[PDB]
Design a protein around this nucleic acid. Sequence first.
DNA 1: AGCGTCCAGTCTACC
DNA 2: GGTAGACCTGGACGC
Length: 289
Amino acid sequence: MKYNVEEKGTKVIVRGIADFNLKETFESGQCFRWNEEEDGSYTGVAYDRVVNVKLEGDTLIIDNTNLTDFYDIWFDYFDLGRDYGQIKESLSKDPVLKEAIKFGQGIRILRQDTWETLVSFIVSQNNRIPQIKKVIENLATSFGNPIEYKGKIYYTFPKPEELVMYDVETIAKTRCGFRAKYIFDAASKVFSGEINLLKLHEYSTSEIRDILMTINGVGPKVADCVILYSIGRYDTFPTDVWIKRIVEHLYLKREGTPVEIQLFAIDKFGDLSGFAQQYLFYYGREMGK
DNA sequence: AGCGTCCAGTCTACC
DNA sequence: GGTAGACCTGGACGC
Ligand code: NA
């Protein structure tokens, strides 16, 4: 991917954008803190920063950032180095994916912070999206740090060190319910250095899975979500109840467990399974039933 | 109406 | 070895 990057005032401008749509990316099920503004831009809090991203054709405008932050954080965050055009061409050899892709041509897989992804998907278990977003914003407001953009105060996602001094019931005030003890355990294990998130990428995918699943409340799905959305292992296929029913309806024509859905997809899609999953998901939400 | 009821991954207890 | 049932919260749903 070749871009023309320029720093103009309080913003960074990227020209040569392809295979990118903000709505499709931000509503693909991968993330929770990006919110649409009246002009169609999206304001989000990630990596202790607040930025506004706007896309005008092939021109991305990131407000409230500099060249240093763009190259250090946002380039990788929006996975800009990857050719999704090639990915879609390869996947479109499957008629099912080709159809799904036409509705989500601009989906990119964000490379998000490991800790935030971990807690976010802990929150996500047995939960609906609107509620997950409210709980995550509650965690940030209650426990995070204030940062300001255009006169409005935004809150960073709380680090393990910013959570450990609170009891479960204090954490539970975020409306996370029975998941409070899971957040508590995750914070404790990371804070003590028992689970090292920085060195996690040095391990195999199976090893990462096992490390993460030591946390009370982290099972196969949460672990796989961290692995895909934060570590960037694309030969994975996180199986939720939706993708199970989607694959059942469109491929298998019979019922199956989340596990058998999973190995079928990884076999068929290989190193592009994670991308295939995103396309199928936004397509499933587009169709409804 | 204004109530009942169903329910959107992981753990636990128990096979 | 494997899994039925419970589970905070809270909108949708039937009558
Ligand atoms: Na666990």
